[PDB]
Amino acid sequence: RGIVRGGETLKEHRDRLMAATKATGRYAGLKTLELREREPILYNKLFSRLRAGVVDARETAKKIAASPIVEQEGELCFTLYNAAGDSLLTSTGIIIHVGTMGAAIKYMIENNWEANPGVHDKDIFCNNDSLIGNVHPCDIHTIVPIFWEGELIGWVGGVTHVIDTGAVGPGSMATGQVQRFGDGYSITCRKVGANDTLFRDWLHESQRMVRTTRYWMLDERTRIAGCHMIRKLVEEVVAEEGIEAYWKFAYEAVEHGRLGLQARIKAMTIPGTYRQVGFVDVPYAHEDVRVPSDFAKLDTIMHAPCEMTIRRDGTWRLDFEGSSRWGWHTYNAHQVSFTSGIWVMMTQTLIPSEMINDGAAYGTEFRLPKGTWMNPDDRRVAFSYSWHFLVSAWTALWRGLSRSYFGRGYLEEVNAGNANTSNWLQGGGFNQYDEIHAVNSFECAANGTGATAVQDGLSHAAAIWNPEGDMGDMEIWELAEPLVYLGRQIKASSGGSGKYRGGCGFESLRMVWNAKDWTMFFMGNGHISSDWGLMGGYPAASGYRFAAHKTNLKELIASGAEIPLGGDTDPENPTWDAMLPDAQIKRDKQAITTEEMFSDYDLYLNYMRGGPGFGDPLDREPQAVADDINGGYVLERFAGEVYGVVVRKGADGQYGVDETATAAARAQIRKDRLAKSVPVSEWMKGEREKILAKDAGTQVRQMFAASFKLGPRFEKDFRTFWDLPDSWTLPEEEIGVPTYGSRYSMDISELPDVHTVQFVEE
Amino acid sequence: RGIVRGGETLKEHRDRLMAATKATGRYAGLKTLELREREPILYNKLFSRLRAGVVDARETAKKIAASPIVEQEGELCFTLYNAAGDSLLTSTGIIIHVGTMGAAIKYMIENNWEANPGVHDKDIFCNNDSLIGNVHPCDIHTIVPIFWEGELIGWVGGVTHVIDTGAVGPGSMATGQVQRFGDGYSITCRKVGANDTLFRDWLHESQRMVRTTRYWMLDERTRIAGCHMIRKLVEEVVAEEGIEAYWKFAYEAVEHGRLGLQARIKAMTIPGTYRQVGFVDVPYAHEDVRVPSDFAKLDTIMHAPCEMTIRRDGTWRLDFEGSSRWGWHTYNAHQVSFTSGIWVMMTQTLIPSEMINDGAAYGTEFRLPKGTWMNPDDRRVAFSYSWHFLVSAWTALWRGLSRSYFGRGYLEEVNAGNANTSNWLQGGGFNQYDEIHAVNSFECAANGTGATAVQDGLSHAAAIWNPEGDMGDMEIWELAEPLVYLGRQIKASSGGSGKYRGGCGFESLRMVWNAKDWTMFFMGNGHISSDWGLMGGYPAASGYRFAAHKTNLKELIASGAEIPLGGDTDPENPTWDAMLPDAQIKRDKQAITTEEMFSDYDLYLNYMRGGPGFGDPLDREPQAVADDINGGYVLERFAGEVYGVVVRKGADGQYGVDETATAAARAQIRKDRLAKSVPVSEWMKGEREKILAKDAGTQVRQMFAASFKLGPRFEKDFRTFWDLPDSWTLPEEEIGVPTYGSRYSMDISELPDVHTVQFVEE
Ligand SMILES: [Mg+2]
Ligand SMILES: [Mg+2]
Ligand SMILES: [Mg+2]
Ligand SMILES: [Mg+2]
Ligand SMILES: [Mn+2]
Ligand SMILES: [Mn+2]
C-alpha cells in the first residue's frame, strides 16, 4: 500500500497529477474548482487560517536565532505543500525557496525515498544540495511530512540562510574554491531525526563541519519550531473542518494561482515578442584572486539573453538560447533556482494580490539549454555565490514587462529593474569572544531600486530576493562581527541617471577591532553594471574596492589627528587617503577577492549598489536635481554634464536652480548630441571590421565562443546581423586561455540510481 | 538495561575495565588468565579459528574492489573487538587502523550513542573523522556491532584506503586546502544502514561528494563483506564452544598481548634513556604551491624529538616534549594516529610473534604535549597527508631500539629505520573511459628499508605503514590511470651509504595518454631526508621533481628521434633534457606542489625513496661496492669518495676491485678526515656565534621559536647546551612571517556535547 491518502505511492500520485496537467492545461486536471465555487465561505476560512499560520511561524520562530541575518533581517521562510510537493501557501521573506524545497520533495518522490529510507510520521529531513535545485549551501532546508490517520496528506518546509557552511572561503558568498570540492557541507535529503528527535551522529558531524557552530545550532532549532507549529495548525484545521474540505483545498489553491497569473497577464500586459539581455564580470585573472587550480585563472563574462513571448491566450514563454557556459568559480546555478527566481520577480509585479504558490510556475514556459550556467551539465560545479549570475540575468526581465505596462498606460507598475545585490562583506578567524568565527553582512539586503515611469526609485531599500529590505542596526552587527562603524552614509551618484533617477545605494566604513588571526575579502560586480536604464535612463554605478592596512590609526586617534569617517563621497577625489600617509591602500576596480590578512585598526569599505534610471535625464525636473545635490544623492559636478541643470549656492549654503542658464544648457546639449553621434550604419561598419579582425579582449571573445557552441540559433543571429562570411570562425581554443570543461562534462544523472526531475525545456 | 552482555551500558562496562587496569597494572584487572591456564587446548582453538577468520576476510573480500590499491596492493584491514572497543585479533595489512577504529568505537561509548541514535543488531556505522583519531579522510571505516541472544558481545571493523574523498586537490594525499574546510568528505560515526541494508540518502550523498564514484562504491561493498563474514564466524564459534569461553577469551587475549610486550622488552633490550630526533620540510613559500589563504604561505620544518625510557620492570615511555606546532597544511595528526603508528613499528620488531592486538598499547606510556602537531588543539586543522610528518617522526625510534639490540648482541634485529614513504603521484580530470577521475599511485608502498648490523637493507620493498610491500603491475595501474609507462628502474645512489647500505628506492617515467582536462602534482620530502643512518651510516637521498610540458613527443616518436625511456639515472648529469629541446622542463627541489595542467605527451617522474645506512662506509666489503655498481645500486663516482674503494672496468664490461689501491685509498681517507675536521668544542664556539647573531633562514628560526613555546624543558636544554645569556630571546613574531594560530586555538572538545577520549599524557 502506498503512503498517500487513498493508497497511491508518492510517485503514483504525482505522476497522475502531472499527466492530467499536461493533457488538460489545468493543474491536476481541475476544470472546475468545487470547493471554491460551491463553498466560498469555507474556501476563504481555510485560506485565512493557513496563511495566518505560515506568516505567524516566520514571525515567531525567528526569535530563536542568535544570528541577526535570521532574527532581525528575517532571511527565513516557511511553506505548506500538498502530497505531490506543490506549494499551497507561504510566509513572505526568502520565497525563492518555495520552489527549491518543493523540488527537493519531488526528488524524494522520484527516487523512491518511500521504500528506503522510508517516509514516516514524525521524521525530520534536512537538505541543501544545489545539484537537485537549491540556490547555495548556506540556505538550509528542514522538511517534515504531515500525516492524518496514518496517511500522508502534505509536507512543511522551513529555510534559514546560515552564516557559513565550512567552504574554503570564510563567509556565505564565498570565494577560494572553484568546484563542489571545498564549496561547503552539502546534505542530500538526509533523514536527520525520527520521533521528533534529532539524531546525535548528525548533531556531532554537522556542528564540526562549520565555523559558526552556535549560530548554526540556533538556526536549526528555528527551522524545526516553525515546521512543528505549522504541522500542529494543519492537524487542528483538519479536525475542525474535516479532511475532505482540506484535501480539496490542497489542489484547488494551486490551480487558482495559475488562473490568477493568466488573468493578470491579460489585464496588464500586451501580446508580442520582447528581447533583452544582461551581463556581469568574473575578473579571476587578477593576482588577488588566489584560487588553487590553474585552469580557473582567467577573466570571463556571464551572458544571459532572453526572448520573452506573451501569447493571446495569456500564457507566456522565456527562452535563454544564447547564454554562456558554467565555469570554474562559485556563480553557477540550476534550472530550479533560476526559474524560481523569475517566479519571485512575478510576485513583486504581476501577482502580488493573487495566490502566492506554485500555480504561477505551471502558467509559465521556460527553455534553458543544457550546459549553460543556468542549467549545467557537470556534477563538479560550485554554487556558494549563485546570486552573482542570477540577479544579473533577472534584472532584464523587468525591462521587458515594463514595456508592456508602459504601452498600455499602467505607468505605476513600470520598474527599470533590480540592483546588483552586493558588496558582501566577508571574513573569518577569532572574534571578540575568542571563538572561531565568520562574518557575512546583510547590509546588501538594502540596495537601490529601479526608477518608475512616474517617480524616482527608492534608495537603500530592497533586494530582488526579498523586497522587505532591512540594513540592520549598527549596534546589532557589532555583536556579531569584530568590527566597528566609522561611517554609514547614502552613496552619492550611485543611482542610475534619468528623468526619474534610480535609487542610490549606501556605504559603511569599518575598522577592525578586537579580532585575532583575522582575514577579509570582497564579492560583487566590478567592471560591469548588470542593470540597464529604461527608455533613455542609465545603469546604476558599478563596483570598486577600498581597503587600508598598517594605517597607524592607534597613534592618529591618540594624537588628535584627522581620522577617516563617513563615506567615500567622491572616489575620484577622495579625502581619506591623504589622512593615512603610512598605510598600504588598495583602491581599484577589483570587486572580487579571496581572503587576505587584516589586523586591528585596518579599514574596509562596504559599498551597496544603486538601481537603474528611467527616461532622458534632460527631461528631469530641474528642482529635483538641486534637491538631490542638497540631499547627498548626486555630486554637484554631474548636474551640468548629465542633466543640463545649472545650480548655484545661495547665502544659506543650499543649491538652487538658475532657470535661464538651465534652458540654454539643455538647448546646447541637444546640439552636442547631434555633433558627437553618427548614423548607426556608420558605427556598425567600424564595429564589423573589429569583429572580422578578432579585435577585443580575451574575456569578450571567450563569452561569444562559448555562447555560440551552446546556442546555434544565437550564432546564426550574430552572423546575419554583422553580415559575416562563413570563412570567419571563433573557436574557443584559439583564444589562448584555459578551456577545461568546454567539451567534456558528466551530469549528476549519470551516477547510479539517480533520477533527476525535469522542470524546463532544455 | 544496558546493552552489553550482563546488563551494563557500554560506558559502565568500559569505565569498570579502565579503572581495574589503572589500579592493578594489568588489562581489566586480570591477575590470572583462567581460560589460557586451565583450558589451553580450547584457548588455542579459539585463537586459531578467529585469527584464520580475520586473515580470510581480508584475502577474500579484497577481490570485490575495482581499485588496485585494495584489490592488488592489499591496503585494507579487518579487526575483531571486545565490547569495550579493545582489539583481540587482526588481519595484516594497514594495521594502524586497529587503533583508529577502536578509538572510534570508544568515542561512541563515551558520547552515549547507546541512547541516541542507538546501537542495534544489524546496524551499519561508517566513519573517517580525523578529529577523533583517524589518519586521514581517505581511510574509510565500516563498523558493525556483534550480538548474542539480544546483547552486545563485540564489534568488527573494516577499513579500505579509497582513491579520493573530494578534497580541493585531486588525490588521496592532497594539497591545495590548508584547513578542514576543503580537506574531504568527513563522516563522524554515522549510522548508514539498518537491518543489513544501506540507506538511500547516504548512498546518493556520499557518491556525489567524491570524484572516483564507482571505485568508492566497490570499496564500500568490500568493507561490508568482510565485516559480515567475521560476524557470521563469531556466531558459529559461540554456538559451537559456548558464550562463556568466548567471553573469557575476549579479555584474556588483550592481557596476554601486554604480557608478551613486557617479556620481549626484558628479553631483547637494555634499561636506560635513549635520545633521538627527526625532521621534514614544508616549502610552502614557492610559487607552485597555490594555496587560497595568505597566512599559509611560508617555509616551515617539522621537529620531533623523543626521549625514550626503558625501565627495569619492562615498561617503557616515549616523551615528545619539544615538538613543533600544528600548521596551515595537510600534514597534521592526532594522538591516536601518532601512537597507533608506534604500535605498528612495535609489531615489526618487538612483538611479531606475540599476540597482535591492543595489549601492547596498554604496556607503553606516551607523552604528547597539547598543541604540538601530533596532538593539536584546534578543530580547523587539515589531515589529508598526515603521513608526511608521521613517517618522519617514527623513523628515529628504530635507532633507539637498535642501540639496545646492538649492545646486547641481537644484531639480527638492528634496523637503521624506515624510508620516507613518497613520492605520491596524484592528479585528476577525465580518464580513458571519459569519466571524472582521480589518481593516487601506491608505488610508494615499495620503498627502501634500513640496513641492519649484519646485512644491507632491501630495495623497493616496504613502507612503515605496511611491511608487505607491493609496487603493483604496470598493466594493472594502466587500467586505473590515463598514463603509460616509459620506464621502471632501480634508483641508483638512493640507499643510505654505510658498512651495510640502506635499500634503494625505484623510479618510473610516465607519459600522459588518453587523458582530457587533466592536472597533476607532487607530494614528498624535498630539502630534508627524514631518516638518519646508524653508528656511522648516512641518510638516504632526499627528493626532487622532474616534469616536462609541450614536449613535442608525438612528432619525435613519429620521426624516429631519441625518446626518454627508463629512469633518471644521474640527475646531476641527465640525458632526457637534451632530447626535448622544445619542452618547458621543471627540474628542481620543489617536491611539494598543487595541481598544474598537463596534456597528452607530457612527462612526470615518480621517484620512490631509499632507506638509511649502517656503520662506517670505510668498513664495507670492497666486492659489495663493485657488485652495487654493476647492479645499478650505486653510481661509479661515489665508490672512491664515500667507500674508499678503487674499481675498474674489466674486458667483460664488469667493474672489479683493485685490492691494493683500495687499502691505500682507505689509509689516506683516514688521514684526510683528521685533517679536515676540528675538535667539537671549536666547531661549537663558531655555531654558538651564529645562534647569538640570529644567522639562520626563517624556516630554522620559526621551528625553534614554536618548539620553545610548546616545550619549556626543550628551551631550557637548548640554552644550557649553547651557554646562551638571558638577554638572548627568539620570539616567533620577530621573524617576519605569518604566525596565525600561534596563540589562539579552539579544540573540538569545546563544542557542545563533545566528550573526547584520552589515550596519552598531554
Ligand atoms: Mg557531457
Ligand atoms: Mg539517471
Ligand atoms: Mg686541520
Ligand atoms: Mg567537552
Ligand atoms: Mn542564502
Ligand atoms: Mn590511507
Amino acid at B624: A
Residue B378 to residues B60, B93, B182, B372, B732, Cα–Cα distance (Å): 40, 31, 16, 10, 19
Across the beta sheet with B603-607, the strand order is B483-490, B506-512, B603-607, B545-549, B584-588
Separation of alpha carbons A396 and A390, rounded Å: 11
H/E element, B281: strand B272-283
Do B380 and A168 lie within an 8 Å CB cutoff? Answer: no
Q: Residue A566 corresponds to which cell in the numbers above?
A: 563617513
- Backbone φ and ψ of B587, nearest 5°: -135, 105
Do A200 and B112 lie within an 8 Å CB cutoff? Answer: yes
Separation of alpha carbons A660 and A163, rounded Å: 56
Count H helices and E strands in chain B, helices first: 19, 22
Separation of alpha carbons B255 and B142, rounded Å: 26
Taking 3-state DSSP, the helix, strand and coil percentages for chain B, each rounded to the nearest 5, stand at 35, 20, 45
Residue where the block lists cell 608526511 = B388
Residue B656 to residues A211, A246, B631, B636, B640, Cα–Cα distance (Å): 66, 99, 12, 12, 13
Contacting residues for B6 by C-beta, under 8 A, at least 6 apart: B151
What is residue A199's DSSP assignment? -
SS3 B180: coil
Separation of alpha carbons B274 and B251, rounded Å: 33
Contact A568, A605 (CB under 8 A): yes
SS3 B585: strand
Residues of B in contact with A168 (CB under 8 A): 168, 177, 179, 181-182, 292
Residue A361 to residues A261, A277, B424, Cα–Cα distance (Å): 9, 22, 52
CA of B162 to the centre of ligand 1 (A): 25
Q: Best residue in B200, B284, B325, B740 to probe A by mutation, most A CBs within 10 Å? A: B200
Do B290 and A294 lie within an 8 Å CB cutoff? Answer: yes
Separation of alpha carbons A192 and A204, rounded Å: 12
Dump strand ranges (E) for B284-383.
Answer: 299-310, 316-319, 364-367
> Alpha helix (H) ranges present in A296-454?
335-347, 359-362, 387-408
| Experimental method reported for this structure | X-ray
Residue in chain A lying closest to B742 (CA): A517
The residues with which A366 forms a beta bridge, in sequence order, are A318
Residues of B in contact with A176 (CB under 8 A): 292-293
Q: Which ligand is nearest to the CA of A337?
A: 5
Residue where the block lists cell 560545479 = A381
What is residue A750's DSSP assignment? G
Separation of alpha carbons B383 and B175, rounded Å: 10
Task: Give ∠ CA B571-B572-B576 in degrees, rounded to 5.
Answer: 50
Q: Cis (ω within 30 of 0) for the bond into B117?
A: yes
Do B753 and A187 lie within an 8 Å CB cutoff? Answer: no
Q: Which ligand is nearest to the CA of A97?
A: 5
> Alpha helix (H) ranges present in A372-493?
387-408, 474-480
SS3 B193: strand
Burial class (CB in 10 A: 0-12, 13-18, 19+), A38: exposed
Show the 3-state SS of A564-632. Answer: CCCCCCCCCCCCCHHHCCCCEEEEECCCCCCCEEECCCCEEEEECCCCCCECCHHHCCHHHHHHHHHHC
Do A197 and B116 lie within an 8 Å CB cutoff? Answer: yes
**Closest by Cβ to A117, choosing from B201, B294, B435:** B201
The residues with which A318 forms a beta bridge, in sequence order, are A308, A366
**Closest by Cβ to B290, choosing from A117, A290, A595:** A290
Do B209 and A180 lie within an 8 Å CB cutoff? Answer: yes
Contact A142, A193 (CB under 8 A): no
Residues of A in contact with B203 (CB under 8 A): 753
- Backbone φ and ψ of B100, nearest 5°: -65, -45
Residue in chain A lying closest to B114 (CA): A200
- Closest CA relative to residue A593, chosen from A657, A543, A650: A543
SS3 B462: strand
Q: Are strands B584-588 and B506-512 parallel, antiparallel or unpaired?
A: unpaired
CB neighbour burial string for A286-306, b if at least 16 within 10 angstroms, e if fewer? eebbbbbbbbbbbbbbbbbbb
Q: Residue B157 corresponds to which cell in the numbers above?
A: 571493523
Chains A, B: CB pairs < 8 Å: 183
H/E element, A100: helix A97-110
Q: Best residue in A293, A745, A751 to probe B by mutation, most B CBs within 10 Å? A: A293
Separation of alpha carbons B68 and B162, rounded Å: 10
Amino acid at A543: G
Residue B396 to residues A43, B30, B300, B320, Cα–Cα distance (Å): 80, 34, 20, 12
Residues of A in contact with B200 (CB under 8 A): 111-113, 116-117, 753
Residues of A in contact with B549 (CB under 8 A): none
The CB density around residue A121, as the number of other CB atoms within 10 Å, is 17
CA of B496 to the centre of ligand 3 (A): 27
Separation of alpha carbons A675 and A84, rounded Å: 63
Show the 3-state SS of B608-657. Answer: CCCCCCECCHHHCCHHHHHHHHHHCCCCCHHHHHHHCCCEEECCCCCEEE
Residue where the block lists cell 587496569 = B21
CA of A757 to the centre of ligand 2 (A): 10
Q: Which residues surround ligand 2, an ion (CB under 5 A)?
A: A 749, 754
Separation of alpha carbons B364 and B343, rounded Å: 9
Contact B424, B444 (CB under 8 A): yes
CA of B344 to the centre of ligand 6 (A): 14
CB neighbour burial string for B573-609, b if at least 16 within 10 angstroms, e if fewer? eeebeebbeebebebeebbbbbbbbbeebbbbbbbbb
CA of A751 to the centre of ligand 2 (A): 6
CA of A600 to the centre of ligand 5 (A): 29
SS3 A304: strand
Q: Residue A531 corresponds to which cell in the numbers above?
A: 542593470
**CB half-sphere exposure, A206, CA atoms < 13 A:** 24
Contact B164, B211 (CB under 8 A): yes
